[PDB]
Amino acid sequence: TMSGGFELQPRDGGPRVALAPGETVIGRGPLLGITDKRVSRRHAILEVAGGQLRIKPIHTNPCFYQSSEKSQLLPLKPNLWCYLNPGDSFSLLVDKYIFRILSIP
């Protein structure tokens, strides 16, 4: 699909992953390059719409969020959306598969 204006930057280093407009299911699989029994194939939904990115955790294993100014990944309340502003981070495990949000054209 087309550019959605956001990219995910792995905090451990490596290629950025571009997001398209609309909903993208994330978890294990080729999109993020994750092969790991600890991460569901249906771990979270990212949605790009109206110039914003939000995440909804959809599995029993949580997602985590760190606002750009803060220092700690916090587990998100399940099955509710959280906006991810550019510079914020989220992760699929508490200390692994962490991504910073970047805004692009």
Swiss-Prot record:
Poly-ADP-ribosylated. In addition to binding non covalently poly-ADP-ribose via its PBZ-type zinc fingers, the protein is also covalently poly-ADP-ribosylated by PARP1. Phosphorylated in an ATM-dependent manner upon double-strand DNA break. Residues 2-105 form the FHA-like domain. It is found in: Nucleus; Chromosome; Cytoplasm, Cytosol. Changing residue 28 to A: Does not affect interaction with XRCC5 and XRCC6; decreased ability to promote non-homologous end-joining (NHEJ). Interacts with LIG4. Interacts with PARP1. Interacts with XRCC4. Interacts (via KBM motif) with XRCC5 and XRCC6; promoting recruitment to DNA damage sites. Interacts with XRCC1. Interacts (via C-terminal disordered region) with histones; interacts with histone H2A, H2B and H3-H4. Histone chaperone involved in single-strand and double-strand DNA break repair. Recruited to sites of DNA damage through interaction with branched poly-ADP-ribose chains, a polymeric post-translational modification synthesized transiently at sites of chromosomal damage to accelerate DNA strand break repair reactions. Following recruitment to DNA damage sites, acts as a histone chaperone that mediates histone eviction during DNA repair and promotes recruitment of histone variant MACROH2A1. Belongs to the APLF family. The PBZ-type zinc fingers (also named CYR) mediate non-covalent poly-ADP-ribose-binding. Specifically recognizes branched poly-ADP-ribose chains generated by PARP2. Poly-ADP-ribose-binding is dependent on the presence of zinc and promotes its recruitment to DNA damage sites. This is Aprataxin and PNK-like factor. It comes from Homo sapiens (Human). The lineage of its organism: Eukaryota, Metazoa, Chordata, Craniata, Vertebrata. The gene is APLF. The chain holds residues 1 to 104 of 511 of the full protein.
